[PDB]
Amino acid sequence: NLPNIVILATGGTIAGSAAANTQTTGYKAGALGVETLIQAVPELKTLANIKGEQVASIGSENMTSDVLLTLSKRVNELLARSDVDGVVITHGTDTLDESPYFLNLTVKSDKPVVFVAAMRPATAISADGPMNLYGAVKVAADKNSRGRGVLVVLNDRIGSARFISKTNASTLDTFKAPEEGYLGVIIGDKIYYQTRLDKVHTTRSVFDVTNVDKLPAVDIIYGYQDDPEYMYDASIKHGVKGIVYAGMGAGSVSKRGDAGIRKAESKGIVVVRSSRTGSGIVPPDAGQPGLVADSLSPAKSRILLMLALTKTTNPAVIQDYFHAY
């Protein structure tokens, strides 16, 4: 009859009370076990019988690469059984830009992996966690929802981890993607799909971390009007593997940045040019240094280069990774 699904908790807002009926102020978030959540929404049972686990309880601001490593692995572990049809994961709102994209490059299965969260506290007037969680499961248990990549579900929308991001600081509808749109929507208890991702992911993925201990170090440097050359000397003097330049316009550099990058490359450090605008593609130009991010954002570019460096260190191949993913 009903399918079996597992909820993996990491903290967040959906599982976090405030101190007032309408308190949307800096409070302590992520203070809820996976046991209670079952309670609050007993309507979940009509959808599918569920089992819960506790993977952690830390703010998304402090989510770390170490955890993503432990998470991806576990995920593959449970997705491999016959009594596990899908997986839902509660997570923070501040870094939901990175976490769901990392598993997109490392889970080896067709069975659904869905992230869910909330902008309003669980005690706020008109809290969204309930209904966002309710629909996050529904898509998990759906047959048609298979083989579409890692998904993100908030505000009645269904979007891919390759495109979505938090576009506004504190609004309910922050997550979106101007250019790419959504995958599908959830209306009237029914689900409607509209489009499919046209990039490589999950199964066809070449990245595997079945047995990796630590990832390389990758920094992000902003580009502005009077940017400091010395900001570069640091990461270098700390031996990081790669650097992601979040630059002006389509990743342009000043005579101070054009200089620092070279200094870095010589030392064997890989650099990638991304934009600071928030949308669009950065094209290539032999008149400038470094490699070029496709239409990946600073945040997601770091997540790519980090895994692209455990495989190889050859520019050509790397560059070709940014256009295929």
| Contacts for 16 with CB less than 8 Å, ≥ 6 apart | 27, 28, 29, 30, 31, 32, 121, 122
Verify whether residue 10 is a known catalytic residue.
no
Contact between 225 and its own copies by CB under 8 A: the answer reads yes
Site for its own copies in 114-143 (CB under 8 A): 124-132, 134
Is 156 in contact with 190 (CB distance < 8 Å)? Answer: no
φ, ψ of residue 94 to 5 degrees: the values are: -75, -30
> Measuring CA to CA, which residue among 147, 118, 148 is closest to residue 135?
118
Pair of tokens at residue 258: 């054009």
Site for its own copies in 192-221 (CB under 8 A): 192-199, 217, 219-221
Contacting range for its own copies; rule: CB under 8 A; set: 79-87, 92-100, 202-210, 307-315: 92-100
The residue from 54, 146, 224, 312 that contacts its own copies (CB under 8 A) is 224
Nearest-approach distance from CB 18 to its own copies, in angstroms: 11
Site for its own copies in 2-21 (CB under 8 A): 20-21
Which residue among 13, 90, 93, 106 is the active-site one?
Answer: 13
Contact between 52 and its own copies by CB under 8 A: the answer reads no
Is 183 in contact with 162 (CB distance < 8 Å)? Answer: no
Contacting range for its own copies; rule: CB under 8 A; set: 1-9, 71-79, 80-88, 245-253: 245-253
Pair of tokens at residue 3: 């399918």
Contact between 319 and its own copies by CB under 8 A: the answer reads no
The residue from 1, 82, 83, 179 that contacts its own copies (CB under 8 A) is 179
Burial 5-32 (b: 16+ CB within 10 A, else e): bbbbbbbbbbbbbbeeeeeeeeeebbeb
Contact between 302 and its own copies by CB under 8 A: the answer reads yes
**Could you give the residue numbers annotated as active site?**
13
